[PDB]
Protein backbone atom coordinates (compact mmCIF):
# COMPACT_ATOMS: atom_id res chain seq x y z
CA UNK A 1 0.00 0.00 0.00
CA UNK A 2 1.06 3.61 -0.64
CA UNK A 3 3.64 2.08 -2.94
CA UNK A 4 4.66 5.29 -4.71
CA UNK A 5 5.42 7.21 -1.49
CA UNK A 6 8.87 7.22 0.09
CA UNK A 7 9.21 5.29 3.35
CA UNK A 8 10.52 8.40 5.12
CA UNK A 9 7.59 10.47 3.83
CA UNK A 10 5.13 7.85 5.10
CA UNK A 11 6.72 8.03 8.56
CA UNK A 12 6.68 11.83 8.51
CA UNK A 13 3.02 11.94 7.48
CA UNK A 14 2.13 9.34 10.12
CA UNK A 15 3.52 11.75 12.73
CA UNK A 16 1.54 14.61 11.17
CA UNK A 17 -1.65 12.53 11.18
CA UNK A 18 -1.20 11.78 14.88
CA UNK A 19 -0.88 15.51 15.58
CA UNK A 20 -4.07 16.13 13.58
CA UNK A 21 -5.75 13.17 15.37
CA UNK A 22 -6.35 11.54 11.97
CA UNK A 23 -5.75 7.98 13.07
CA UNK A 24 -7.19 6.24 10.01
CA UNK A 25 -4.71 8.20 7.89
CA UNK A 26 -1.97 7.41 10.42
CA UNK A 27 -2.71 3.68 10.18
CA UNK A 28 -2.71 3.76 6.38
CA UNK A 29 0.64 5.58 6.36
CA UNK A 30 2.21 3.11 8.80
CA UNK A 31 0.75 0.15 6.88
CA UNK A 32 2.47 1.54 3.79
CA UNK A 33 5.69 1.96 5.77
CA UNK A 34 5.58 -1.66 6.96
CA UNK A 35 4.98 -2.93 3.43
CA UNK A 36 8.21 -1.28 2.27
CA UNK A 37 9.70 -4.46 3.74
CA UNK A 38 12.26 -2.91 6.11
CA UNK A 39 12.33 -3.61 9.84
CA UNK A 40 10.82 -0.94 12.10
CA UNK A 41 12.69 1.17 14.65
CA UNK A 42 11.52 1.54 18.25
CA UNK A 43 9.83 4.85 17.39
CA UNK A 44 8.25 3.44 14.24
CA UNK A 45 6.83 0.44 16.11
CA UNK A 46 5.20 2.90 18.52
CA UNK A 47 3.65 4.81 15.61
CA UNK A 48 2.25 1.59 14.14
CA UNK A 49 0.78 0.59 17.51
CA UNK A 50 -0.70 4.01 18.34
CA UNK A 51 -2.39 4.33 14.95
CA UNK A 52 -4.18 0.98 14.96
CA UNK A 53 -4.93 1.13 18.70
CA UNK A 54 -6.89 4.34 18.07
CA UNK A 55 -8.67 2.99 14.98
CA UNK A 56 -9.73 -0.28 16.58
CA UNK A 57 -10.48 1.55 19.83
CA UNK A 58 -13.14 3.61 18.09
CA UNK A 59 -14.61 0.49 16.49
CA UNK A 60 -14.68 -1.43 19.79
CA UNK A 61 -16.39 1.49 21.53
CA UNK A 62 -19.01 1.69 18.78
CA UNK A 63 -19.51 -2.09 18.78
CA UNK A 64 -20.16 -2.08 22.53
CA UNK A 65 -22.76 0.69 22.19
CA UNK A 66 -24.57 -1.18 19.41
CA UNK A 67 -24.29 -4.59 21.09
CA UNK A 68 -25.83 -3.08 24.23
CA UNK A 69 -28.73 -1.62 22.23
CA UNK A 70 -29.17 -4.95 20.43
CA UNK A 71 -29.33 -6.90 23.69
CA UNK A 72 -31.94 -4.50 25.07
CA UNK A 73 -34.00 -4.99 21.90
CA UNK A 74 -33.98 -8.77 22.52
CA UNK A 75 -35.54 -8.67 26.01
CA UNK A 76 -38.85 -9.71 27.53
CA UNK A 77 -41.36 -6.98 26.78
CA UNK A 78 -39.55 -5.72 23.67
CA UNK A 79 -41.16 -3.93 20.74
CA UNK A 80 -39.71 -5.32 17.50
CA UNK A 81 -37.63 -2.63 15.78
CA UNK A 82 -36.65 -4.71 12.74
CA UNK A 83 -33.25 -6.05 11.66
CA UNK A 84 -31.58 -2.62 11.68
CA UNK A 85 -29.73 -2.80 15.01
CA UNK A 86 -28.36 -6.27 14.25
CA UNK A 87 -27.46 -5.27 10.68
CA UNK A 88 -25.55 -2.17 11.79
CA UNK A 89 -23.78 -3.97 14.64
CA UNK A 90 -22.75 -6.59 12.08
CA UNK A 91 -21.43 -3.83 9.80
CA UNK A 92 -19.26 -2.33 12.55
CA UNK A 93 -18.21 -5.81 13.70
CA UNK A 94 -17.12 -6.77 10.17
CA UNK A 95 -15.14 -3.54 9.82
CA UNK A 96 -13.46 -4.18 13.19
CA UNK A 97 -12.52 -7.73 12.21
CA UNK A 98 -11.08 -6.37 8.97
CA UNK A 99 -8.78 -4.00 10.87
CA UNK A 100 -7.67 -6.79 13.21
CA UNK A 101 -6.98 -9.09 10.26
CA UNK A 102 -4.97 -6.32 8.58
CA UNK A 103 -2.78 -5.84 11.66
CA UNK A 104 -2.35 -9.59 12.12
CA UNK A 105 -1.42 -9.83 8.45
CA UNK A 106 1.30 -7.21 8.89
CA UNK A 107 2.73 -9.06 11.89
CA UNK A 108 2.68 -12.34 9.95
CA UNK A 109 4.05 -10.76 6.73
CA UNK A 110 6.67 -10.25 7.84
CA UNK A 111 7.30 -8.24 11.01
CA UNK A 112 7.50 -11.08 13.53
CA UNK A 113 9.73 -13.47 11.58
CA UNK A 114 12.33 -10.74 11.01
CA UNK A 115 12.25 -9.50 14.63
CA UNK A 116 15.26 -10.97 16.42
CA UNK A 117 15.85 -8.58 19.30
CA UNK A 118 13.81 -9.05 22.47
CA UNK A 119 12.37 -5.52 22.39
CA UNK A 120 11.01 -5.89 18.85
CA UNK A 121 9.91 -9.53 19.09
CA UNK A 122 8.05 -9.06 22.39
CA UNK A 123 6.47 -5.87 21.05
CA UNK A 124 5.06 -7.62 17.98
CA UNK A 125 3.93 -10.73 19.86
CA UNK A 126 2.13 -8.53 22.38
CA UNK A 127 0.38 -6.84 19.46
CA UNK A 128 -0.55 -10.25 18.06
CA UNK A 129 -2.12 -11.24 21.37
CA UNK A 130 -3.92 -7.89 21.57
CA UNK A 131 -5.56 -8.09 18.15
CA UNK A 132 -6.59 -11.71 18.62
CA UNK A 133 -8.06 -10.53 21.93
CA UNK A 134 -10.06 -7.88 20.07
CA UNK A 135 -11.30 -10.58 17.69
CA UNK A 136 -12.22 -12.68 20.73
CA UNK A 137 -14.29 -9.83 22.19
CA UNK A 138 -16.78 -10.12 19.29
CA UNK A 139 -16.48 -13.83 18.47
CA UNK A 140 -19.47 -16.13 19.01
CA UNK A 141 -19.07 -18.90 16.45
CA UNK A 142 -17.22 -22.19 15.98
CA UNK A 143 -13.85 -20.37 16.26
CA UNK A 144 -14.21 -18.30 19.46
CA UNK A 145 -12.18 -21.00 21.21
CA UNK A 146 -9.52 -21.08 18.49
CA UNK A 147 -9.25 -17.27 18.52
CA UNK A 148 -8.82 -17.28 22.31
CA UNK A 149 -6.09 -19.91 22.05
CA UNK A 150 -4.38 -17.84 19.34
CA UNK A 151 -4.33 -14.85 21.70
CA UNK A 152 -3.05 -16.96 24.61
CA UNK A 153 -0.30 -18.51 22.49
CA UNK A 154 1.00 -15.13 21.29
CA UNK A 155 0.91 -13.65 24.80
CA UNK A 156 2.61 -16.73 26.24
CA UNK A 157 5.50 -16.66 23.77
CA UNK A 158 5.94 -12.95 24.47
CA UNK A 159 5.94 -13.58 28.23
CA UNK A 160 8.55 -16.34 27.98
CA UNK A 161 10.90 -14.06 26.02
CA UNK A 162 10.36 -11.04 28.29
CA UNK A 163 11.07 -13.04 31.45
CA UNK A 164 14.34 -14.30 29.93
CA UNK A 165 15.55 -11.15 28.18
CA UNK A 166 14.13 -8.08 29.95
CA UNK A 167 14.33 -6.63 33.46
CA UNK A 168 11.09 -6.73 35.49
CA UNK A 169 10.64 -2.95 35.11
CA UNK A 170 10.87 -2.87 31.29
CA UNK A 171 7.76 -0.95 30.12
CA UNK A 172 7.05 -3.43 27.31
CA UNK A 173 7.35 -6.35 29.74
CA UNK A 174 5.02 -4.55 32.16
CA UNK A 175 2.47 -3.62 29.49
CA UNK A 176 2.53 -7.17 28.14
CA UNK A 177 1.76 -8.57 31.59
CA UNK A 178 -0.97 -5.96 32.09
CA UNK A 179 -2.73 -6.88 28.84
CA UNK A 180 -2.23 -10.62 29.36
CA UNK A 181 -3.84 -10.21 32.78
CA UNK A 182 -6.76 -8.40 31.15
CA UNK A 183 -6.99 -11.32 28.71
CA UNK A 184 -7.20 -13.75 31.63
CA UNK A 185 -9.89 -11.72 33.38
CA UNK A 186 -12.08 -10.58 30.50
CA UNK A 187 -11.62 -13.28 27.84
CA UNK A 188 -10.42 -16.56 29.37
CA UNK A 189 -12.67 -16.53 32.49
CA UNK A 190 -9.57 -16.92 34.68
CA UNK A 191 -9.78 -14.02 37.15
CA UNK A 192 -7.50 -15.75 39.66
CA UNK A 193 -4.79 -16.10 37.00
CA UNK A 194 -5.34 -12.44 36.13
CA UNK A 195 -4.93 -11.30 39.74
CA UNK A 196 -1.89 -13.52 40.33
CA UNK A 197 -0.13 -12.26 37.21
CA UNK A 198 -0.80 -8.59 38.02
CA UNK A 199 0.37 -8.99 41.64
CA UNK A 200 3.54 -10.92 40.77
CA UNK A 201 4.33 -8.45 37.98
CA UNK A 202 3.82 -5.45 40.27
CA UNK A 203 5.85 -6.90 43.15
CA UNK A 204 8.81 -7.90 40.99
CA UNK A 205 8.85 -4.50 39.28
CA UNK A 206 8.83 -2.72 42.66
CA UNK A 207 11.87 -4.69 43.79
CA UNK A 208 13.75 -3.58 40.66
CA UNK A 209 12.91 0.15 40.78
CA UNK A 210 16.10 0.99 42.71
CA UNK A 211 18.12 0.29 39.54
CA UNK A 212 16.38 2.97 37.48
CA UNK A 213 17.09 6.56 36.54
CA UNK A 214 14.53 9.25 37.33
CA UNK A 215 13.07 9.06 33.81
CA UNK A 216 12.92 5.25 33.62
CA UNK A 217 11.43 5.24 37.12
CA UNK A 218 8.56 7.41 35.88
CA UNK A 219 8.05 5.17 32.83
CA UNK A 220 7.78 2.00 34.92
CA UNK A 221 5.80 3.36 37.88
CA UNK A 222 3.16 4.69 35.47
CA UNK A 223 2.43 1.20 34.16
CA UNK A 224 2.70 -0.26 37.66
CA UNK A 225 -0.14 2.08 38.64
CA UNK A 226 -2.27 0.56 35.88
CA UNK A 227 -1.62 -2.90 37.32
CA UNK A 228 -2.59 -1.55 40.75
CA UNK A 229 -5.77 0.04 39.34
CA UNK A 230 -6.86 -3.33 37.93
CA UNK A 231 -6.04 -5.16 41.16
CA UNK A 232 -8.13 -2.59 43.05
CA UNK A 233 -11.04 -3.29 40.69
CA UNK A 234 -10.67 -7.09 40.80
CA UNK A 235 -10.18 -7.56 44.56
Amino acid sequence: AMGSMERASLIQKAKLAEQAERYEDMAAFMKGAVEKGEELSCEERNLLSVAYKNVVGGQRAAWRVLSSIEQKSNEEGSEEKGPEVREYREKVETELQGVCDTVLGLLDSHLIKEAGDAESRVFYLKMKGDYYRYLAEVATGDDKKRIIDSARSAYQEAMDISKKEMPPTNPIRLGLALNFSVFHYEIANSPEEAISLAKTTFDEAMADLHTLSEDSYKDSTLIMQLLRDNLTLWT
Binding site: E18, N46, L47, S49, V50, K53, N54, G57, D130, G175, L178, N179, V182, Y185, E186, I223, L226, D229, N230, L233, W234
Partner: peptide
Amino acid sequence: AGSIPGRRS
Protein backbone atom coordinates in the same frame (compact mmCIF):
# COMPACT_ATOMS: atom_id res chain seq x y z
CA ALA B 1 -10.41 -3.46 33.77
CA GLY B 2 -8.00 -1.47 31.64
CA SER B 3 -5.38 -2.54 29.13
CA ILE B 4 -2.51 -0.25 28.13
CA PRO B 5 -4.18 2.89 26.71
CA GLY B 6 -1.52 3.37 24.05
CA ARG B 7 -3.44 6.05 22.14
CA ARG B 8 -0.67 8.68 22.45
CA SER B 9 2.89 8.27 21.20
